[PDB]
Amino acid sequence: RRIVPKLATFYSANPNHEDRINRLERLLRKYIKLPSQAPWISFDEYALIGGGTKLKPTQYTQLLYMLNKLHNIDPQLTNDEITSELSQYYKIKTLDEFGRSIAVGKRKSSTAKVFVVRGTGEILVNGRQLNDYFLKMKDRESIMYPLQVIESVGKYNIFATTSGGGPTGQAESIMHAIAKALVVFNPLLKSRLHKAGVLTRDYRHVER
Amino acid sequence: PVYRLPPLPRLKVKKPIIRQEANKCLVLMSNLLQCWSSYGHMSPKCAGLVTELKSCTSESALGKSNINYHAARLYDRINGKPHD
Amino acid sequence: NILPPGVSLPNDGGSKSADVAAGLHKQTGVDPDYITRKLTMKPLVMKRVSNQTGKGKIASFYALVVVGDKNGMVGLGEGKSREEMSKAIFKAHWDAVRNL
Amino acid sequence: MKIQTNAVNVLQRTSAYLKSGLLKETPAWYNVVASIPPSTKFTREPRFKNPSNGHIIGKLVDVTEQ
Amino acid sequence: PYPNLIPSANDKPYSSQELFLRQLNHSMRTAKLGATISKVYYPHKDIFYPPLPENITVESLMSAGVHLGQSTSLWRSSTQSYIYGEYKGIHIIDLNQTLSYLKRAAKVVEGVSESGGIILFLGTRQGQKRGLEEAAKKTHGYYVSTRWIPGTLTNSTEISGIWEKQEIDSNDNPTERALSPNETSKQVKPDLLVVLNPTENRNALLEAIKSRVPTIAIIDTDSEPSLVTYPIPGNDDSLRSVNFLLGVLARAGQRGLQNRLARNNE
RNA sequence: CCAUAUAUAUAAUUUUAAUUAUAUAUAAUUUUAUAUUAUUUAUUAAUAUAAAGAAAGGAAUUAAGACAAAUCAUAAUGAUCC
Ligand SMILES: [Mg+2]
């Protein structure tokens, strides 16, 4: 009997990668006519099955390009061959019983927990009036901003409960929590809120 | 006539010259300065140009040669050296 | 015992001619038995060659050997080694076997 | 480049290796290359006739012909 | 046939995928009606329907552009005997010599494949991968088209020693036997090397010379004939001529393989 | 590994700060679709626009030279001295 190298690309730099790309090209070539229209294995994961140390990032990008081209084929016209080949490389909030959306936000060392219900724009902070708790107009406007982004100011009642940090931190925590609570009532507005900058935590904090 | 260089260690330009395009803000400023020089400062004639500058610099005040690479890549093909 | 899946210790696993023959059969397909039995080596040149370098002078050992089966096959091999002369002789034997 | 000897005489080198005992198994190509000898002449060949127009090269008309 | 496809209702119009399948059905049946095309060159066929060595004529070699040699200013004078003449500033290759050398090289490839040897198709120019891969697949051989690593033959342990190897029967059937580490780490050397661009692959030619690997190549007007065992005078810079010659050699190898299998099945 | 965002567990919500505490686990080096300009011209960068995004920061972790030391209080051993 005869000992021969397994792969047709044995004398290339990275025979495993070349052979795998050859199979992918063969499938992409047989079914070139099919029209078109979920992460893949990582670089180390493909290194294990390919060239290992010989694997190169350009080779990995080529693999991903072919895999994305094959996957992007229209699902209704795909078949068992393409899916079988590709399989080798594959790696809700609601209101409570009282109709309230509960959210928790943070800013600096301040934390806020807000109950947002449908109402007429009334707001309480720590059981106190907004103007009594927040003397600074800027903080009040910061709390208002997410409500007025979705133009729903005057349509919800807010019960905010803060602790930690100072005035501005508590106010902006109320802001972020109010945004997160508002997303529940109408998920379609989330992107709008997300584009206003009120749905992203301000990760900035005091550093040594 | 054609001049043929000897087999050279390299084919490279010492100082590749690139065509940076003069900033629009600078030329608009120059035009405004010439306007106020001729008609006068805050003259009615060229005041419109001022508006453009007020916009053009509003966001920011001011708003690459591959010859050596290609020469090095292609030299072995085009040098026309004798065979061996 | 706690042996790994494959040990490689020929005495504890739980010369020039032999290593030359094995490496040559591994790298080029030459027969080990022919090398070990039939070929004979005599070192022709053995010297020390030096190279200057900014940090210091570096010494290396150069060996030139000739191998042959005395029946019409002869080869010349040269070997360099900074570490030891024996390794230079080993490399020279390797090259001479390759140049038969 | 000089006319290269080693490229076309691979069969002879392999035969020496095999008969000496340095190589034990004949390569698969040995019998084929033995059956089909490589061309081992690299000679500049004279040309006496231009095929395109038939002009004959290498002819001198002697004095007697005129 | 076409799983995971949801047809449309009769009341509604065709979908995009239904239109695609409808047009495919039209194409496979009626689009080819009206005439049959004859005596027209289709490039893909040069890879998939190569002619046998005995059926090759000088006209067929000239149609592929095999005769068109390098510029007269880049002449390698050692290739004088292969040249028919010069025309329009380039040297013309003598296609009768090309036919003889090509038939000889095809016989060499057929013999090597019939003996079960390893055939390596090396060509590193831009668009040569398709023909190289098809030749290797139909000859049960191997190919390289990205780059020839220097030392692939003379330093095989440090280059190709890590890749896996395989025991196979006389009928090229996998045996799935477990190979010992020493067997896996041996050099596996090509029995025949064919080079499409020998001018840009001097390293491979020199390694084959050192390792005693007989080699075939397409020898253009500027290439050295004596660096290879079995030269093929022809144009190496045109993809059509290269693919024609490669297809001829690959068909010879396939014929040798088929003869081997036929004898093993009797 | 921190920090951040989430999930599970734990707490008979009087050790109450459940907005909390600390264990395990996940997540990102962000992913994409186009437009323009450059491009080794695409299976590329600069931006900008749109979409899914909580995702925006940080520390540590190796050797080779060369200089400086006796509050070298960053020590040991030795030399000498009472
Ligand atoms: Mg050429």
Curated annotation (Swiss-Prot), chain A:
Cite the entry's keywords alphabetically: Mitochondrion, Ribonucleoprotein, Ribosomal protein, Transit peptide
Q: Which GO terms describe its molecular function?
A: RNA binding; structural constituent of ribosome
* GO BP annotations listed: mitochondrial translation
Q: Where in the cell is it found?
A: Mitochondrion
State any GO CC term: mitochondrion
Q: What does this protein do?
A: Component of the mitochondrial ribosome (mitoribosome), a dedicated translation machinery responsible for the synthesis of mitochondrial genome-encoded proteins, including at least some of the essential transmembrane subunits of the mitochondrial respiratory chain. The mitoribosomes are attached to the mitochondrial inner membrane and translation products are cotranslationally integrated into the membrane.
**Self-association state and partner proteins as the record states:** Component of the mitochondrial small ribosomal subunit (mt-SSU). Mature yeast 74S mitochondrial ribosomes consist of a small (37S) and a large (54S) subunit. The 37S small subunit contains a 15S ribosomal RNA (15S mt-rRNA) and 34 different proteins. The 54S large subunit contains a 21S rRNA (21S mt-rRNA) and 46 different proteins.
Q: Which family does it belong to?
A: Belongs to the universal ribosomal protein uS9 family.
Name it.
Small ribosomal subunit protein uS9m
Q: What is the lineage of its organism?
A: Eukaryota, Fungi, Dikarya, Ascomycota, Saccharomycotina
Q: What part of the entire protein does this chain span? A: 35 to 261 of 278
Curated annotation (Swiss-Prot), chain B:
Could you tell me which cysteines form disulfide bridges? C25-C56, C35-C46
Assembly information from the UniProt record? Component of the mitochondrial small ribosomal subunit (mt-SSU). Mature yeast 74S mitochondrial ribosomes consist of a small (37S) and a large (54S) subunit. The 37S small subunit contains a 15S ribosomal RNA (15S mt-rRNA) and 34 different proteins. The 54S large subunit contains a 21S rRNA (21S mt-rRNA) and 46 different proteins.
Q: This protein is called what?
A: Small ribosomal subunit protein mS37
Q: Which GO terms describe its biological process?
A: mitochondrial translation
Write down the species. Answer: Saccharomyces cerevisiae (strain ATCC 204508 / S288c)
Q: Is Transport set as a keyword in this record?
A: no
Annotated family: Belongs to the mitochondrion-specific ribosomal protein mS37 family.
Q: What is the lineage of its organism?
A: Eukaryota, Fungi, Dikarya, Ascomycota, Saccharomycotina
Q: From the UniProt record, report the name of the gene that encodes this protein.
A: MRP10
> Where is the protein found, in the record's own terms?
Mitochondrion; Mitochondrion matrix
GO molecular-function terms, A-Z = structural constituent of ribosome
Motif placement: Cx9C motif 1: 25-35
Curated annotation (Swiss-Prot), chain D:
Subcellular localization: Mitochondrion
Highest taxon in the source lineage: Eukaryota
Any further remarks?
A: Present with 1920 molecules/cell in log phase SD medium.
Q: What family, per the record?
A: Belongs to the mitochondrion-specific ribosomal protein mS23 family.
Please describe what this protein does: Component of the mitochondrial ribosome (mitoribosome), a dedicated translation machinery responsible for the synthesis of mitochondrial genome-encoded proteins, including at least some of the essential transmembrane subunits of the mitochondrial respiratory chain. The mitoribosomes are attached to the mitochondrial inner membrane and translation products are cotranslationally integrated into the membrane.
Q: Quaternary state and partners of this protein? A: Component of the mitochondrial small ribosomal subunit (mt-SSU). Mature yeast 74S mitochondrial ribosomes consist of a small (37S) and a large (54S) subunit. The 37S small subunit contains a 15S ribosomal RNA (15S mt-rRNA) and 34 different proteins. The 54S large subunit contains a 21S rRNA (21S mt-rRNA) and 46 different proteins.
Q: Could you tell me what this protein is called?
A: Small ribosomal subunit protein mS23
Report the source organism. Answer: Saccharomyces cerevisiae (strain ATCC 204508 / S288c) (Baker's yeast)
Residues of the whole record sequence present? 1 to 66 of 264
UniProtKB/Swiss-Prot annotation, chain E:
Primary location class: mitochondrion
Q: Does the keyword Mitochondrion apply?
A: yes
Q: Which cellular component, as a GO term, is one annotated location? A: mitochondrial inner membrane
User: What are its GO biological-process terms?
Assistant: mitochondrial translation
Nucleotidyltransferase: is it a keyword of this entry?
no
Q: Which keywords accompany this UniProt record?
A: Mitochondrion, Ribonucleoprotein, Ribosomal protein, Transit peptide
Q: Where in the cell is it found?
A: Mitochondrion
Report the GO molecular function annotations.
structural constituent of ribosome
Further remarks about this protein from its record? Present with 6890 molecules/cell in log phase SD medium.
Subunit structure comment from the entry? Component of the mitochondrial small ribosomal subunit (mt-SSU). Mature yeast 74S mitochondrial ribosomes consist of a small (37S) and a large (54S) subunit. The 37S small subunit contains a 15S ribosomal RNA (15S mt-rRNA) and 34 different proteins. The 54S large subunit contains a 21S rRNA (21S mt-rRNA) and 46 different proteins.
The UniProt entry's sequence similarity note says: Belongs to the universal ribosomal protein uS2 family.
Q: What does this protein do?
A: Component of the mitochondrial ribosome (mitoribosome), a dedicated translation machinery responsible for the synthesis of mitochondrial genome-encoded proteins, including at least some of the essential transmembrane subunits of the mitochondrial respiratory chain. The mitoribosomes are attached to the mitochondrial inner membrane and translation products are cotranslationally integrated into the membrane.
Q: What is the protein named?
A: Small ribosomal subunit protein uS2m
| Species this chain originates from | Saccharomyces cerevisiae (strain ATCC 204508 / S288c)
Gene transcribed to yield this protein? MRP4
Give the fragment's position in the full-length protein. 128 to 393 of 394
